[PDB]
Amino acid sequence: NTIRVFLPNKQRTVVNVRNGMSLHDCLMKALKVRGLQPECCAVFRLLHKKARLDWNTDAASLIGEELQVDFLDHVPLTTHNFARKTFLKLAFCDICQKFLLNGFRCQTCGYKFHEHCSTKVPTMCV
Amino acid sequence: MTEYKLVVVGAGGVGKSALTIQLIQNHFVDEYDPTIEDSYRKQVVIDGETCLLDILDTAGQEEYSAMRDQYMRTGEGFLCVFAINNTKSFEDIHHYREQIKRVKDSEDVPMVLVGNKSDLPSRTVDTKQAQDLARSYGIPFIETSAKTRQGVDDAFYTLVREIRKHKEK
Ligand SMILES: Nc1nc2c(ncn2[C@@H]2O[C@H](COP(=O)(O)OP(=O)(O)NP(=O)(O)O)[C@@H](O)[C@H]2O)c(=O)[nH]1
Ligand SMILES: [Cl-]
Ligand SMILES: [Cl-]
Ligand SMILES: [Cl-]
Ligand SMILES: [Cl-]
Ligand SMILES: [Cl-]
Ligand SMILES: [Mg+2]
Ligand SMILES: [Zn+2]
Ligand SMILES: [Zn+2]
Ligand SMILES: [Zn+2]
């Protein structure tokens, strides 16, 4: 009893369904681990474009169908834009808080970090 | 920006999802929530290069072996995960390796053997057993704990480096 759900930024999840679950219920964890919030997302139903759904719909009514989740229309939560950086002033890494001689910096949000701290930078650029 | 197609495979419950989520979210998933199919994307600086990692987290069990064929064809490198406290999961590794080799038609596929749950004291797969198996496949072996994050970076960094060693990226 499943639904394949396409997620923003070319991701996807297949969620398990048992009677008594809303769309917000089945997808809360999938969005969380990916740095996404249902507040900035809409959920649709794939047709063969798409059809907007409310986040509290009975998931059992959508079993065997294909869904899609998108950022808010023209409010796309962007992805970081990393650039190599030599810090001339005293700088510390935003991940490990240790001294940062040189590292990387997102040109959009300003996160600065060591290369080997980069896996800990959050996925989404705020 | 250079994209890397990684696939995490192994028996159910070895920690494939906990490893991936530790990389993606920097959080340990304590619950058991068996995977059907989950893909993730994350940017990672590896040897000064910004890398887009496309990570496919897979199910421990598929009803038909043929259901894996497609994602093994598209995947560029494979983390083959067992748990050091789960002898059956170590014994199951070879089935994944032989399926990947069959689908790719190559004995030189980028892969890393990952022995996870190294935090648990009930170890039953010795590190020499694991090294022997990795040596027999010609691949690296890395011990990880998704719970403490020991070795998690190492596993994914090493897999990316194995992909580059195999093909121009
Ligand atoms: N102590 C410890 N527990 C771990 C570790 N990694 C995973 N676990 C636990 O092991 C269980 C299964 O982990 P999980 O990531 O779901 O495994 P999986 O290989 O993805 N399972 P599946 O194939 O069904 O999707 C969970 O309870 C999780 O918390 C680890 O390194 N240490
Ligand atoms: Cl500066
Ligand atoms: Cl910050
Ligand atoms: Cl390839
Ligand atoms: Cl040992
Ligand atoms: Cl590491
Ligand atoms: Mg899983
Ligand atoms: Zn379709
Ligand atoms: Zn950013
Ligand atoms: Zn740091």
Author numbering:
A (entry chain B): 56 to 103, 108 to 185
B (entry chain A): 1 to 169
Task: Copy text from the publication.
The interaction of membrane-bound active RAS with RAF is the first step in the activation of this pathway. Active RAS recruits RAF to the membrane where RAF dimerizes and becomes active. The N-terminal CR1 region contains the RAS-binding domain (RBD) and the cysteine-rich domain (CRD), the CR2 region contains a 14-3-3 recognition site, whereas the C-terminal CR3 region includes the kinase domain and a second binding site for 14-3-3 proteins. Here, we present crystal structures of wild-type and oncogenic mutants of KRAS in complex with the RBD and CRD of RAF1.
We crystallized the GTPase domain of KRAS (residues 1–169) in complex with RAF1(RBDCRD) (residues 52–188) and solved the structures in two different crystal forms, I and II, at a resolution of 1.95 Å and 2.50 Å, respectively. Despite having different crystal packing interactions, the structures of both crystal forms are very similar, with r.m.s. deviation of 0.40 Å for Cα atoms or 0.45 Å for all atoms. Since crystal form I was solved at a higher resolution, subsequent analyses are based on form I unless stated otherwise. The overall structure shows that the two tandem domains of the RAF1 CR1 region, RBD and CRD, directly contact one another to form one structural entity, and RBD as well as CRD interact with KRAS to a similar extent. Similar to what has been observed in the HRAS-RAF1(RBD) and Rap1-RAF1(RBD) structures, the KRAS-RBD interaction interface is mainly formed by the switch-I region, where RBD and KRAS interact mainly via β-strands and form an extended β-sheet structure. Interestingly, the CRD interaction with KRAS does not involve the switch regions. Instead, the KRAS-CRD interface is formed by KRAS residues present in the interswitch region and the C-terminal helix α5. In the KRAS-RBDCRD structure, RBD and CRD are connected by a short linker (residue 132–137), which brings these two domains together with interdomain contacts, resulting in an extended structure. Calculation of the solvent-accessible area shows that 658 Å2 of RBD and 555 Å2 of CRD are buried when RBDCRD is in complex with KRAS, suggesting that both RBD and CRD have similarly sized interaction interfaces with KRAS. Similar to the solution structure, our crystal structure contains two zinc finger motifs—one near the N- and C-terminal ends of CRD formed by residues H139, C165, C168, and C184, and a second one near the β3 strand and 310-helix formed by residues C152, C155, H173, and C176. The structures of the KRAS-RBDCRD complex provide atomic details of the KRAS-CRD interaction interface, which is similar in size to the KRAS-RBD interface and also consists of nine hydrogen bonds.
